[PDB]
């Protein structure tokens, strides 16, 4: 949630951001933040001003979106790991209080729009009113267990556990749309993972190594750059935008140098600015153990999927049935090797003007 990092790497070091197809990640075990996906499915998949629900009044749009998107991860060749979110750290209290103030403001203008009596304004202000719940992640972990996708529970924010999973070499990419996963230390980030029917969206893949080679920084230095840019664990200095942050991290090579030489009349350093604790959080978070988890893609249980999704969620049997048959087709394709395993990439550019 770093303010202006995607545009920063797009406009400073564009050799790191390589746009790729969804088909080009065949046989790649990748780690996906689950709560960002759940918010995508309970925001995007709506009818008539309402979330997609069953006849019992339970929310089931997240299970719908998770099932179809995760199947689309299977035919494109990639192997998903759904790192679910855990307890956020104690420095995120201001950010979650700001989120709760935003949702309460959206609730009061939702009540104002319902007093005025619209439809699109009401569906927008309840699209902003979306919250993950323990039963939401519980039912999605249940669904990915029956599909055979390896669910993981982070003890921190799941971008950190995704970064620790790619850092151990267990998975190829941390496939979150969040900027904070690069600062948590993912060597590969990839964004915009809408694996869809003929969308042809390029997967915005962020590689940390070409960032730290092109910007002339190391890992703690990029942490200090993102803290000065503005994370979700501490505030930023007012008046310091992206390009000034790039210049200050490039010409002082610390953040305590920016503390010790700056004018307080013009650029106000905050007195409650707890940058060292968020720096140590981005260096050493409370991640899961990457070498003790079960990263396996088992056979999908057809029968409990039909019983769960047709007794509790009353989904139509033909769509999820054909989805699990093409899951079976993609699982026979899942053992297929990649040619990067046998040949090393030497001509990385092969430029054509």
């Amino acid at each position: 949630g770093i303010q202006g990092l995607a545009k920063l790497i797009a406009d400073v070091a564009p050799s790191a951001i390589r746009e790729n197809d969804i088909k080009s990640y065949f046989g790649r075990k990748v780690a996906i933040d689950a709560s960002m996906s759940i918010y995508q499915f309970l925001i995007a998949v709506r009818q008539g001003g309402d979330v997609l629900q069953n006849e019992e009044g339970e929310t089931t749009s997240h299970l719908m979106g998770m099932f179809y998107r995760t199947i689309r991860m299977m035919e494109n060749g990639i192997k998903p790991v759904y790192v679910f979110d855990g307890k956020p750290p104690q420095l995120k209290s201001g950010e979650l209080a700001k989120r709760s103030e935003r949702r309460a403001e959206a609730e009061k203008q939702l009540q104002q729009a319902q007093a005025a009596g619209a439809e699109q304004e009401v569906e927008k202000f309840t699209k902003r009113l979306v919250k993950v719940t323990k039963q939401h992640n519980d039912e999605c972990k249940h669904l990915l267990s029956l599909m055979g996708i390896p669910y993981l529970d982070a003890p921190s924010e799941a971008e950190a556990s995704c970064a620790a999973l790619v850092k151990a070499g267990k998975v190829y990419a941390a496939a979150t749309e969040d900027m904070d996963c690069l600062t948590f230390g993912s060597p590969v980030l990839m964004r915009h993972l809408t694996a869809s029917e003929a969308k042809k969206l390029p997967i915005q893949e962020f590689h940390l190594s070409r960032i730290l080679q092109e910007l002339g920084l190391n890992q703690e230095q990029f942490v200090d750059l993102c803290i000065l840019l503005g994370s979700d664990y501490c505030e930023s200095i007012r008046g310091i935008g992206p390009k000034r942050a790039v210049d200050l991290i490039q010409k002082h090579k610390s953040i305590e140098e920016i503390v010790r030489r700056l004018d307080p009349n013009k650029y106000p350093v905050p007195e409650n600015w707890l940058h060292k604790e968020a720096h140590q959080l981005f260096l050493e978070p409370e991640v899961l153990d990457p070498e003790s988890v079960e990263l396996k893609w088992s056979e999908p249980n057809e029968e409990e999927l039909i019983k769960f999704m047709c007794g509790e969620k009353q989904f139509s049997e033909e769509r999820i049935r054909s989805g699990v048959k093409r899951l079976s087709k993609s699982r026979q394709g899942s053992t297929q090797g990649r040619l990067d395993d046998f040949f090393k990439v030497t001509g990385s550019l092969s430029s054509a003007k």
Partner: protein
């Protein structure tokens, strides 16, 4: 850059073989020859296409050019050429326009085709030069037939070599399959024979959809050289008529 190809049906067959596997590729055009080391969009297969300058007619290349050609549009442009057509490649200094002049055999229909280019970057793999432990030389129609009929009943071949010969075994939900071949050193034939050099009796599982994409080069070479060893990817060499090779690489399952 001026490359006049007298047998332009060769280039028509090359881009028909390149049509379905990949859609965009970067041509490593140098003075030694026209090259194309391109990899699949699913990043599993690879195309090593090499057309040397000794197999062209009056080849010229000043700079080390490299242009990125939409191969579906190049296949649509090269399908305008005839069977006995003389195709003249031409390009400028900048990667903007690739001229494809189709000189008629009886000089009555000169067909100038300027082609719009793309500016994309593709990944090159460093392929080592090693001795494969199982070199299988096969007729091209039989390898085409084996791939297109085992793909009906299977998702993957299990290519097993032995003293007797290669064994294209496929398995599926439709019924179990098996195609066995045998080498013949007795008939001493030229194109319809199977030549199998063995070191190890290798048994590797290859995806058969990509082998169907590979068997589109069958018109380019009656001799198909399947060279493989244990846990090293299959190279499927279609030796073009005295210009070079169209080598197809494929990762085992």
């Amino acid at each position: 850059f001026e490359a006049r190809l007298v047998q332009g049906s060769i280039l028509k067959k090359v881009l028909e073989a390149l049509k379905d596997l990949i859609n965009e590729a970067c041509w490593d055009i140098s003075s030694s020859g026209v090259n194309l080391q391109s990899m699949d969009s699913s990043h599993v297969s690879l195309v090593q296409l090499t057309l040397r300058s000794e197999g062209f007619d009056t080849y010229r290349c000043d700079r080390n050019l490299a242009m990125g050609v939409n191969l579906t549009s190049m296949s649509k442009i090269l399908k305008c050429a005839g069977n006995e057509d003389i195709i003249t490649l031409r390009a400028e200094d900048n990667a903007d326009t690739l001229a494809l002049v189709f000189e008629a055999p009886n000089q009555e229909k000169v067909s100038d085709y300027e082609m719009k280019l793309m500016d994309l970057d593709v990944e090159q793999l460093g392929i080592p030069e090693q001795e494969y432990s199982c070199v299988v030389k096969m007729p091209s129609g039989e390898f085409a037939r084996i791939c297109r009929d085992l793909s009906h009943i299977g998702d993957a071949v299990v290519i097993s070599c032995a003293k007797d010969g290669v064994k294209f075994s496929a398995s599926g939900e439709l019924g179990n399959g098996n195609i066995k071949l045998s080498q013949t050193s007795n008939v001493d034939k030229e194109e319809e024979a199977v030549t199998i050099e063995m070191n190890e009796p290798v048994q590797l599982t290859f995806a058969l959809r990509y082998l169907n994409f590979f068997t589109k080069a069958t018109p380019l070479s009656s001799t198909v050289t399947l060279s493989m060893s244990a846990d090293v990817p299959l190279v499927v060499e279609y030796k073009i008529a005295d210009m070079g090779h169209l080598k197809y690489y494929l990762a085992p399952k």
